[PDB]
């Protein structure tokens, strides 16, 4: 089921299970147990941008930015806010902002 205009989603590759946030909201300190650390694709709504971290709590500027529909292949080596090239395909935290 596709992300709304003002919502961003990660989706388990293996199971199809979705975790979504409206624009203006972030995850807990960690994603819930039922998605944390599963390989995902991003489905970000037209007005939304998904911020992922590979660590808990969107921490140490280990943050990557995703818009539209992104497959995990294209999330393995992404320039983070901190200038490192990280893998966000198995995220531990998330925020959704306006694109």
């Amino acid at each position: 089921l596709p992300a709304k205009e003002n919502e961003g989603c990660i989706v388990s590759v293996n199971s199809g299970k979705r975790y979504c946030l409206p624009v203006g909201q972030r995850s807990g300190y960690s994603l819930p147990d039922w998605i944390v650390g599963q390989e995902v694709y991003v489905d970000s709504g037209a007005k939304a941008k998904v911020l992922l971290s590979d660590w808990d709590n969107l921490s140490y500027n280990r943050i990557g930015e995703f818009v539209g529909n992104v497959n995990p292949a294209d999330m393995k080596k992404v320039k983070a806010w901190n200038g490192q090239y990280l893998d966000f395909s198995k995220p531990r935290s998330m925020r959704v902002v306006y694109k």
Partner: peptide
């Protein structure tokens, strides 16, 4: 500054 983490308590 950037968000931080802490070690899990026992």
């Amino acid at each position: 500054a950037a968000s931080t983490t802490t070690p899990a308590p026992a």
